[PDB]
Design a protein around this ligand. Structure first.
Ligand SMILES: CCOC(=O)c1cn(C)c(=O)cc1Cl
Ligand SMILES: CCOC(=O)c1cn(C)c(=O)cc1Cl
Length: 114
């Protein structure tokens, strides 16, 4: 079996809600990184394809995903960007690692139900 495109929001939104529920860990991920505002002006020199929770949520609300892998792909893009840009000792890097642990715990039982 599969999750059809029209089933994606109902099946996958709880995994995204679980990320948002992590506070403070999700806070650096809720909106697109604004390099000038955040005092990290080299961000787009390092990160080629930004991704954040608000973008994923909009795509999941508005039918922009056709298959589960596309949602999962954007989530890992968001995490990988943060592990790439931020130092291993940094708050954002460590928050990213916590969110990834939460994501794995939430997405695995959903995808393994198929
Ligand atoms: C996936 C449900 O969305 C949230 O849980 C959520 C969404 N936004 C846009 C927020 O700013 C905060 C939360 Cl908690
Ligand atoms: C809202 C504050 O966000 C950040 O400070 C931040 C977020 N991300 C995802 C980064 O990769 C780097 C920073 Cl500095």
């Amino acid at each position: 079996k599969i999750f059809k495109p029209e089933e994606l929001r109902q099946a996958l939104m709880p995994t995204l809600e679980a990320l948002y529920r992590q506070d403070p860990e999700s806070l650096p991920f809720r909106q697109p990184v604004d390099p000038q505002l955040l005092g990290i002006p080299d961000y787009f020199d390092i990160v080629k394809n930004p991704m954040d929770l608000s973008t994923i949520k909009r795509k999941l609300d508005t039918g922009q995903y056709q298959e589960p892998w596309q949602y999962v792909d954007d989530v890992w893009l968001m995490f990988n960007n943060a592990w790439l840009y931020n130092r291993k000792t940094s708050r954002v890097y460590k928050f990213c690692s916590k969110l990834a642990e939460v994501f794995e715990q939430e997405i695995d039982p959903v995808m393994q139900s198929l």
